[PDB]
Amino acid sequence: DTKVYLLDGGSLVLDGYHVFWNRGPGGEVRFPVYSILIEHAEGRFLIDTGYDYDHVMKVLPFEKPIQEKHQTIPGALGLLGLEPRDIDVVVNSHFHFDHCGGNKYFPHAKKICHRSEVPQACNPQPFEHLGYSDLSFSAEAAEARGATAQLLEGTTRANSTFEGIDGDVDLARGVKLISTPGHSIGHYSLLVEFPRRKPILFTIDAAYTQKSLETLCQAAFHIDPVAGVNSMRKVKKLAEDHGAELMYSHDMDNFKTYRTGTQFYGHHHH
Amino acid sequence: DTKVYLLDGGSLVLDGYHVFWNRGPGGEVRFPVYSILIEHAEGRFLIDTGYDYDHVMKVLPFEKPIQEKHQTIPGALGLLGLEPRDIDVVVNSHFHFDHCGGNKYFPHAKKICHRSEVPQACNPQPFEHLGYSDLSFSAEAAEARGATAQLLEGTTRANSTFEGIDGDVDLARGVKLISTPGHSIGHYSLLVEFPRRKPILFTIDAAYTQKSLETLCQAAFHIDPVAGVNSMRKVKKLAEDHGAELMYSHDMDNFKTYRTGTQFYGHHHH
Ligand SMILES: Cc1ncc2c(c1O)COC2=O
Ligand SMILES: Cc1ncc2c(c1O)COC2=O
Ligand SMILES: Cc1ncc2c(c1O)COC2=O
Ligand SMILES: Cc1ncc2c(c1O)COC2=O
Ligand SMILES: [Zn+2]
Ligand SMILES: [Zn+2]
Numbered sequence: 001d002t003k004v005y006l007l008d009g010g011s012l013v014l015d016g017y018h019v020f021w022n023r024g025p026g027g028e029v030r031f032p033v034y035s036i037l038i039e040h041a042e043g044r045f046l047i048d049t050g051y052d053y054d055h056v057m058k059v060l061p062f063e064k065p066i067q068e069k070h071q072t073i074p075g076a077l078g079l080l081g082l083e084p085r086d087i088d089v090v091v092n093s094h095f096h097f098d099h100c101g102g103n104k105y106f107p108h109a110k111k112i113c114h115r116s117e118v119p120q121a122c123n124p125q126p127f128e129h130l131g132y133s134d135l136s137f138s139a140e141a142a143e144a145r146g147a148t149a150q151l152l153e154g155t156t157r158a159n160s161t162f163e164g165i166d167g168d169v170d171l172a173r174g175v176k177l178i179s180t181p182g183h184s185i186g187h188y189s190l191l192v193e194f195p196r197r198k199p200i201l202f203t204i205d206a207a208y209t210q211k212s213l214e215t216l217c218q219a220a221f222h223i224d225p226v227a228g229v230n231s232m233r234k235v236k237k238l239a240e241d242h243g244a245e246l247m248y249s250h251d252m253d254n255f256k257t258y259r260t261g262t263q264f265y266g267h268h269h270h
Numbered sequence: 271d272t273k274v275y276l277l278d279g280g281s282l283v284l285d286g287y288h289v290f291w292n293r294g295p296g297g298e299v300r301f302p303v304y305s306i307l308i309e310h311a312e313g314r315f316l317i318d319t320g321y322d323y324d325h326v327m328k329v330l331p332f333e334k335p336i337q338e339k340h341q342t343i344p345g346a347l348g349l350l351g352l353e354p355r356d357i358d359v360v361v362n363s364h365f366h367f368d369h370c371g372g373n374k375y376f377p378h379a380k381k382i383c384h385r386s387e388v389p390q391a392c393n394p395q396p397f398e399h400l401g402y403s404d405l406s407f408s409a410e411a412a413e414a415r416g417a418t419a420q421l422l423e424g425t426t427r428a429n430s431t432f433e434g435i436d437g438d439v440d441l442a443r444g445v446k447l448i449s450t451p452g453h454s455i456g457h458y459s460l461l462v463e464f465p466r467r468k469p470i471l472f473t474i475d476a477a478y479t480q481k482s483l484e485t486l487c488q489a490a491f492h493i494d495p496v497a498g499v500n501s502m503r504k505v506k507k508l509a510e511d512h513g514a515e516l517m518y519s520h521d522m523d524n525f526k527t528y529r530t531g532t533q534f535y536g537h538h539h540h
């Protein structure tokens with residue numbers, strides 16, 4: 001019928017000026033990170049794979065990760081009686097480290113990302129190195145960036161090739177990847193339709209929080225802030241023209257009301 | 271990949287002479303009843319649906335049913351985060367009451383049984399009335415037997431029509447219904463193949479216990495005991511010629527070693 005499970009992936013810390021470009025205010029802010037499991041008649045799709053705890057502790061310990069073992073990808077799938085192997089397709093919104101930390105566990109799945117994202121990861125802008133700091137999702141990108149030491153044993157170029165896409169696309173029936181560049185060169189948001197509840201528009205990094213979308217204030221991490229704003233406009237109109245419940249990527253106060261673990265969206269209405 | 275879940279449906283009591291036709295020995299014997307959930311790339315298949323507790327307490331209280339609420343069909347599916355609605359196909363080995371008690375919860379699923387079983391249920395041998403005592407699986411059979419009082423509200427002829435089959439058939443890839451008549455006119459056993467463990471041959475009522483199969487001693491409930499014995503021979507050879515682990519329908523001492531609830535057969539071998 002289509003169910004959506006949120007895999008709770010723990011949390012990270014940014015300054016308020018990171019979350020709210022120039023606006024802020026400043027001071028530490030902790031936000032959640034999660035992934036999106038779609039159980040669908042055409043297969044099990046995982047959208048993003050959270051952050052890898054060792055990677056963050058090594059490279060971004062100032063983000064002070066807190067992630068319990070049920071909040072790794074295999075752990076969170078564990079709560080559903082699932083293993084990484086049960087996932088048929090992994091989709092990455094973009095290759096910032098907190099959205100592709102768990103790709104390494106899916107050599108057998110088909111991978112999908114925007115055409116431009118793997119090239120970006122191999123060779124990012126000088127201000128993007130930190131965002132694209134976990135190359136374990138791609139043997140190729142790891143090579144180009146000289147970070148093959150991140151590759152999990154058994155990751156080859158063969159089991160980590162992506163099918164590049166472009167523009168708005170149907171992942172499956174009732175499931176659209178919505179093109180939302182700006183934050184990154186090939187950033188995608190997600191729209192999931194159900195049969196007895198209103199569509200869900202997952203903003204991912206096009207809108208970190210409700211506050212972001214409300215004031216058109218994007219995150220300070222972006223490659224193109226004009227594009228970033230247009231993508232917010234596009235996401236706002238999309239939500240309106242559909243019936244969509246907007247679910248945000250990194251919004252602690254909103255996250256508390258989100259279903260994680262064994263709870264899911266898309267229940268049968270008797 | 272193909273997983274098999276056993277839905278534990280509680281237990282019932284027969285005399286030893288029932289379980290072991292003429293051989294026995296006598297005295298009360300309690301045995302388990304269960305159903306077979308196959309999660310498969312072609313859908314979720316439920317083979318049999320246990321016994322309905324109210325039906326047994328009313329009509330066969332001498333069988334002294336013990337069935338906790340997690341051991342009804344919706345309850346047992348409950349332990350998997352599933353509802354009756356998530357099942358795509360219900361297959362009935364035959365329409366004895368302890369194998370079709372839960373059919374009433376699946377109006378939306380496709381139903382499959384042997385060509386002869388619905389006609390048998392409508393109009394059984396005089397010695398079969400008790401076996402075919404729960405007609406809630408079929409609006410039509412309930413009418414013919416004047417037991418429409420068993421029909422759950424919303425059960426119509428439309429949502430309880432079966433596709434009749436005959437001979438050995440592939441339910442799905444790696445999943446065969448093996449024709450095993452004798453115990454009932456159109457009784458089927460089940461063979462499930464996996465990719466990293468030996469096939470499982472579910473005998474259902476063709477062989478109640480390991481002891482039954484070992485000594486060719488069928489249950490005392492049968493329509494044709496010559497056929498019944500041939501079907502045991504057929505099941506023994508099937509198991510040999512394949513690699514199959516034989517799993518029996520009503521074998522308490524063997525049942526204790528069977529995986530029920532959240533445990534399943536067909537794990538990925540890393
Ligand atoms: C580690 C951690 N950080 C944040 C949250 C949780 C965590 O386990 C659970 O719900 C949360 O918001
Ligand atoms: C959470 C987080 N930390 C650092 C970066 C990003 C993040 O989302 C994106 O680009 C970055 O440098
Ligand atoms: C009610 C009941 N009867 C038998 C068994 C169980 C029961 O809950 C569980 O495992 C069994 O063998
Ligand atoms: C368990 C049980 N009880 C009664 C009958 C059957 C049973 O399996 C089959 O035919 C019957 O009359
Ligand atoms: Zn990002
Ligand atoms: Zn992010």
Ligand SMILES: [Zn+2]
Pocket residue numbers: 364366453454475491
């Ligand atoms: Zn029977």
Ligand SMILES: [Zn+2]
Pocket residue numbers: 366368369474475519520
């Ligand atoms: Zn039986």
